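Researcher: Here's my situation. A collaborator sent me these components and asked whether they could plausibly form a single complex. I don't have experimental data yet, so a predicted model of the whole assembly would be a useful starting point for our discussion.
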Amino acid sequence: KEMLAEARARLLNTQGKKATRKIRERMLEESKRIAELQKRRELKQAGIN
Amino acid sequence: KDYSRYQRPRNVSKVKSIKEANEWKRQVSKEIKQKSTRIYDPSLNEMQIAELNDELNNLFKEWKRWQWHI
Amino acid sequence: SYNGIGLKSAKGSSTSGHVQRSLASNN
Amino acid sequence: VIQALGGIETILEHTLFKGTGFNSWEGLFWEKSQIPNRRFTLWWSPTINRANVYVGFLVQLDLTGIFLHGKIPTLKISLIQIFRAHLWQKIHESIVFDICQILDGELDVLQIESVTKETVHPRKSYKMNSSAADITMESVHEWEVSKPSLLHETNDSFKGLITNKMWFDVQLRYGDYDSHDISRYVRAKFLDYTTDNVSMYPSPTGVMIGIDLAYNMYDAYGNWFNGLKPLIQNSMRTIMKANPALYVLRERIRKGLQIYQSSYAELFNNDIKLFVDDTNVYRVTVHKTFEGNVATKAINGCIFTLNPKTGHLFLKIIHTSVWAGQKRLSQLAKWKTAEEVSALVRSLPKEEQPKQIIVTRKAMLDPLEVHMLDFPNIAIRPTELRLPFSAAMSIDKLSDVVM
Amino acid sequence: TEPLLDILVKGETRIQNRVKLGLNSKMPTRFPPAVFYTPKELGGLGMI
RNA sequence: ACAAUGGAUUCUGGUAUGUUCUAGCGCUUGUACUAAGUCUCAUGUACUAACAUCGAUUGC
């Protein structure tokens, strides 16, 4: 059952390193933008533009 | 002007000069910006915000200390 | 002298091309 | 094939065999039959890096006096590792120090008022273009020197020049298969440097000692006033064997070449056995600063041994005036304790002499193993079981004699 | 056989040039017959 | 009665690569207590060499 779970995980992953690395990088970039936008909104609440 | 080797540093008394303290103070605000950005994330994990939240309380206490000295 | 003996050249031969007469072969 | 290439002694002239410090090619085995390439080209380095090059741009290594004819990168990595941590400079300061420690021992028969080592440029030791004097001798009466002759010259005519001051130069070269005659090298550099105007010597009529670091050969060429030529050839034979810097040179070659040299109840038996304690030699007591510092103070020590059959003590007091002129001093101590064990062996007749010598801590055994090798019957062992020691320092009588 | 003797000369000097390509020099003076033909107990290659 | 003698050296070699590092304002709204540096040796760990490892004989 353990090797069946490992084979089930291996058959259902089709991406690769560069594709997976790119997905992680894209998520990081999206999080960095959302954080900076929130930081600007909170400073806009304090009057500083 | 460098000061990378020097700690934050948690001790305050050792440096008498304020103008040097002007540089030490930014040395702290920069981390405040990095970690602060590191506060909101798509994952929003409790463990990461939770450690950052403690760092924020530690920094705010330091701001209270600098205000008290003045 | 090159009396029909020796090499066309010593470039691709990996030798020097030095020819000396056999003193053993005389009669 | 060994007969075809001229015997073993012609083959070893191509190699770095004499740099290892091994006396003869007897019982010498390689260790690892496949050998890697880095220790192949280091073994054949005098004939790979030889001076009969057809074309090759002469470079010099950054800290040493090795000249590379072109680029052999597999050899250059080995020569950087062997001559690392400024070893070329540290060797040259060790011979200059050891000559000064031999001149002042026999200073009365030479009649020097002082023997002075000069301030050495740190680039001077690996400067093959020019040189300067290292050790200057000032004389009370005016010396009469000979014609400049080689170190092993028979006779000297001392009626030539009458001078008041002599100088020493210590030259270090790295030989090849082609140019490694040290007797030709020192004669050529002496007759070139004294005729050159840029090379600054304080006086004429000096001598020059040259050491080949590749073939551990030594030679001297210069004019002698009296007595030094039997003295300086007896001194260099002790220096070339017991130098702590040349020992590091020979050890770093043996690591790069990977060459080793093969070949509790018994303590009290009739066999004579020395148990050596060197802890007593080195002592430092802390002295309080006005603000904060470590005092450079050492108390005079003693070299301690015992025999079981004789049941007696041997003691060599060492005064801290010897410790005033060096650094890493406690590492120099093991060499001095080695000399005194070798002399304490040498003073006794060989039957009375120990078949084996045991020491507490083997931090100091290897220099003990270096100097003592004058007679083959002598074995050296560690203590299986640690004993503290230094009852002698707490014994009031022995401590009173030392203090 | 004369063709085989030209093969033996050209074949053995390719083995020697491989040792000369491991280093960055094919110069003849740096490589005597003592380097290649001395036995392995003396530190050479032991080439026959 | 044989005089015959080729060579040769440089460059392209696992952290590569990638990102951020606003101090010096652009007008309006909004008196919370004492660990230095360099060099050398030893040991421990991690990474790395796109390194190497079997050549031969026995007393029941």
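Model: Some features of this prediction you could bring to your collaborator: The radius of gyration of chain D is 24 Å. DSSP finds 13 helices and 15 strands in chain D.
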